[PDB]
């Protein structure tokens, strides 16, 4: 138990899902068909772990920042952790709101140890489906990205995104048994092996994807 995050709290914690489907014409970005399926899957699979999930749809950049800022200002004293899942278009190191782009780092910074004291020493987890083409204040974050930098992240209009579908499959099966890195490693394998793109266009045909986990965690995390 000295090597695992303490989970003896009233609540596992809040889980915010931002589900961005429809985009303003000014952005030139297409409708993300399949994302509603991802969001519904994620609601169920994160709820099963014990998270108090809330879903927000088609958020502007300002709304995304406000949601996360307000969340960081809530009292997490009785929560074991915090999770946020972002579903959108992305590029660089940014994520699309309905009206343009906003830096991912600005979204997560609200939860730094010196800015969110009631989550100090507790895991802060960010799962991001989007393209990417005494205690340290940066400790205890984990980012689970659908893809490594510089590559596409793939979405099936009928089934949802590869990463989300893999993530929820592994969580519903092993989420109550395995440590979060064991979980995400299996997600890496599942996405890498069981998916391959299909397109009439060769530039988008027969492509592969590998997700990317970035861990600043200081303990093992079990959802039990």
């Amino acid at each position: 138990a000295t090597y695992q995050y303490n989970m003896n709290f009233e609540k596992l914690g809040k889980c915010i899902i931002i589900n961005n489907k429809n985009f303003d014409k000014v952005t030139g970005m297409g409708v993300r068909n399949g994302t509603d399926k991802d969001a519904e899957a994620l609601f169920k699979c994160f709820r099963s772990l014990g998270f108090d999930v809330i879903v927000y749809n088609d958020c502007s950049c300002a709304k995304m920042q406000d949601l996360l800022k307000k969340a960081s200002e809530e009292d997490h004293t009785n929560a074991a952790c915090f999770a946020c899942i972002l579903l959108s278009h992305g590029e660089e190191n940014v994520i699309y709101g309905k009206d343009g782009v906003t830096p991912i780092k600005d979204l997560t910074a609200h939860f730094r140890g010196d800015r969110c004291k009631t989550l100090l020493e507790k895991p802060k987890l960010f799962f991001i489906q989007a393209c990417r083409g005494k205690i340290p204040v940066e400790a205890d974050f984990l980012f689970a990205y659908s893809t490594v930098p510089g590559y596409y992240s793939w979405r099936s209009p009928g089934r949802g995104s590869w990463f989300v579908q893999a993530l929820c499959s592994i969580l519903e099966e092993h989420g109550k048994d395995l440590e979060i890195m064991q979980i995400l490693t299996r997600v890496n394998d599942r996405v890498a092996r069981h998916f391959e793109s299909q397109s009439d266009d060769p530039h988008f045909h027969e492509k592969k994807q590998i997700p990317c986990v970035v861990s600043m965690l200081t303990k093992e995390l079990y959802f039990s």
């Binding site: 297409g30 993300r32 068909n33 399949g34 959108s88 278009h89 992305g90 489906q129 989007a130 393209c131 659908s146 596409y152 992240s153 793939w154 979405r155 099936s156 209009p157 995104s161 793109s197 299909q198 397109s199 988008f204």
Partner: peptide, 4 residues
């Protein structure tokens, strides 16, 4: 398939 589509990309994000």
């Amino acid at each position: 398939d589509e990309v994000d």
